[model samples]
Target: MRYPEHADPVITLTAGPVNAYPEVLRGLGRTVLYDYDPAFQLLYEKVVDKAQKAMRLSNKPVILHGEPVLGLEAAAASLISPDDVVLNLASGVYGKGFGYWAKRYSPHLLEIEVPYNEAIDPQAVADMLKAHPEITVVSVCHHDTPSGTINPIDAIGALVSAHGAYLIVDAVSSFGGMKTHPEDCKADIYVTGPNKCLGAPPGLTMMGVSERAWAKMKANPLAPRASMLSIVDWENAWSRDKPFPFTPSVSEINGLDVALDLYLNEGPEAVWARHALTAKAMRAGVTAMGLSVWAASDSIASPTTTAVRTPDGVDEKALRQAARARYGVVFSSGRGETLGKLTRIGHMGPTAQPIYAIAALTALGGAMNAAGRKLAIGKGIEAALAVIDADA
Candidate 1:
């Protein structure tokens, strides 16, 4: 039999699951072990230790046995109390989604929403905290992947911390690709995963939690305990020799171990620079092709994904299908509120290379041309190449 591959030779240009590293898949080939065995327990602890080092976290980081949404929801359920006031910061689709999570558990939820094109203002958060001293929890997304915009988590984190409030930062997409030192940002609970920029599969949610956060969660009588969403079970998994809440996903943990090793071996600073360079190249290419970027401006645009506006008279869905069906490549449409308004080109994980960006530009330019919008042939690719080479 021939080597296994997708029906088409696929190149994923979408937001996530963007081409796992070979080492990660190879690591997953290891045989599963008894979950409660001493060796397996040690292995689990090592993974958490590595994760903490990578995230610059002081507390024992929790590896939730599901996707990042699991960690997000569980954090809210654990910390938000019926008597406490939650201030949900909403700048985009994912940010607004967090508001839903906050409201689901908290009795009093106040949302401060800004336009999708704008970043959350730190001064506004300070003012809100002053006006509402009852606010006990402040949750915000560091990067809104759907809108390809980044909120100012650093400034916001400081503001919330100063006001004696808990901070939950959704750093799901930006954690590995960008710089998000949880302690530096004073994030009480920082949610992230290995799937996005760490080049691992989608079944894991890694988080950094503070002592204050742990105290609050443990004090809350309604907090999840003895449940899949329980942080309490994993609380003593490292130092106290407690059993896990449930059986962990062995293969996913193995894969994440390898992914983290690869990430650190290459150096986090280098990885971050690579992602930043790729995003800069993409922005340069798309702009040269006469398309406007979907972000509010360059300042708030995400390094992991670049969302671009589809020119009027060009069908966004049609362009995407043409790329996938004809070119064996894929791109993403805008999510939730921004749907049909823009297209996304993801430069993340193993796919964050100039070649992939060039291919995407070529496919996109061709698709647009087929739809009767003119492109200057190789202009986009040329611009992208120049940027990459200059940075090199």
Candidate 2:
């Protein structure tokens, strides 16, 4: 059952690796440059600067040579010493998965896990820190993409800071779409990428590293120094005076530079508002269509992606396939523990507009009807339009 070549659907609303912005796709096709060329080096530094501005960070940002997952693992490797006691906050799939990486570096890993449909309570995190004074590091995912839920990282980071513990935040899906910033969260290592809300193809990681995190990584003897997962290797990579540890992803950086410009020129606040409005309209449409959102509450729902609960007696996979086949609209399915339980519609980058909610609801409602479930597609669209109009 192989898919045909160039079989991409007309509309792709996946959680990450979303449909790249048209400008970014053109940017990727630009001439690739030599890794050591002074022009490329300056371009890389400019990209880093744009990323720092996008993230609203005063500290220098590290752009890793791989996707955001590389930055996530590197953070655990460089910050979690063998003697450290780590606290992992798990409210969704990605948040829970970070615990495994933390465990690889430290034997003592404490976790505060909540249901996947819910967000982590900052009070619970405070309680955990109070009970475990020995906890030296804390890790959380700002927006767990698989579940389409967000954690209150700002509150949790405040608690971690008061506890004097290092904070590692995976903001891959949340950074550009929402009001999240590394400095506001007090994150020692804040990991994000251009692939998700930033509207670029997946290839590189953008991270903000605090001075204290750099010091800790420098002190950790077991931290990878020359390997691909080494965060220490990138400490000075943003500077033109220092050489990169290896060849950087030049074409991807070019695409990211353009993507960052798009984001900045539009203004971060406007971009975030667009994402929020799209998600809000999506939730309203789905609810009006007799469907439930996967998040336990609206407050925890992520603006970039909305996970819809799989209706009873309907196959989640079939629903998504029907949407793609009938309307050329593709959505995402839940991952790992969430598989088959929900379908995800992403409103990211170019698709992060209020009007996309109509396309999503139309495809979903039509697909549900095709699956023998009666749904009034017009009602959903109307509800979504009401949201958009009210905002206007």
Candidate 3:
């Protein structure tokens, strides 16, 4: 069956799958390698090594055959036994969504949730842990993309570690964009992907699995053995002597290799700095434009994506359509609970440049004006430039 062809927007500033690096796109076009071939095995091992280095992970890196959502669900399925007590920390949409999976795996799922626009407080986590000493596992999302808010996973992880419970962190959007690492958060299962901050298409999940987490899955008899979502099935897949659970995504792996190279060569800290600066400039511009950010405070706002509160009387859908149709710039709309309440500007990978902030502000301000909402477009660009200049 044939489908209608459509061109991508000239400028993609969505939360993710953001515009990939040109090198990565080229890499995806590389000839596919047979998964069972020795050469492909070597390439796969190298990719895993690069991912480990990029994540600064001390644990084993597990490259799953699907995007991070698969890994996120797999983590809950493999780790949470029916008898286990789970504590899910929900600060935003993604964080709260993880609880659904947790509940599916185990009936005893407790939560310490704050408003979507706010960050999870470490003190609240500490209090929760103290109150519920039976909690055997804890889960959190480092950055909740839909709400464009970040949680303090490090502090929360510390609490979970001290409680002798497993900590699973969903860093899908935050890992490559910031200075986040599995070891730093003491995460037993750290889920992330190349599609978000690494400048690649969505296809695989690059995860960090602690030894304890592996042991827990091994002991939990209900854990999947050979299925696609089974983390246990991949425990030995990285070894050349062992056969894969199934054929890997060879082309996506090729693209991820290139993305990892660009990230490492540029230096992770430098890449993270670029993302931070872009977000800062974007927020400055938004504020100058007389619009409010969706996050309750600047500290909770994510560096990867910025959610702007929709102005009164301005239609969020029409505003995005105006930006795309009139300016050829594409922005993301809020998802699930946040839908229609806010608009998102993403700064992932190559689009994390400070100059993009000017483009985003211009498109957003113009769209607002088209919707009959008055905005000083020049003022927004000026404020963004000031922030970028000060950084320089």
Compute the lDDT of residue 240 as modeled in candidate 2. Answer: 68
Tens-digit lDDT track of model 2 for 131-186: 99999999999999999999999999999999999999999998889899999899
Candidate 1 weakest lDDT stretch, 10 residues: 1-10
Q: Report the lDDT of model 2 for residue 103.
A: 95
Tell me the alpha-carbon RMSD of every candidate.
2.6, 1.8, 2.6
Question: What are the models' TM-scores?
Answer: 0.96, 0.97, 0.97
The window of 10 residues in a row where model 2 has the poorest summed lDDT is 1-10
Which candidate do you rate higher for lDDT, 1 or 2?
A: 2
On lDDT, the stronger of 1 and 3 is 3
Candidate 3: C-alpha lDDT? 0.92
> What order do candidates take by lDDT, descending?
3, 2, 1
Question: On a 0 to 100 scale, what is the lDDT of residue 97 in model 3?
Answer: 98
Q: Which stretches of candidate 1 lie over 4 Å from their true place?
A: 1-6
Q: Would you list the C-alpha lDDT of every candidate in the order shown?
A: 0.86, 0.91, 0.92
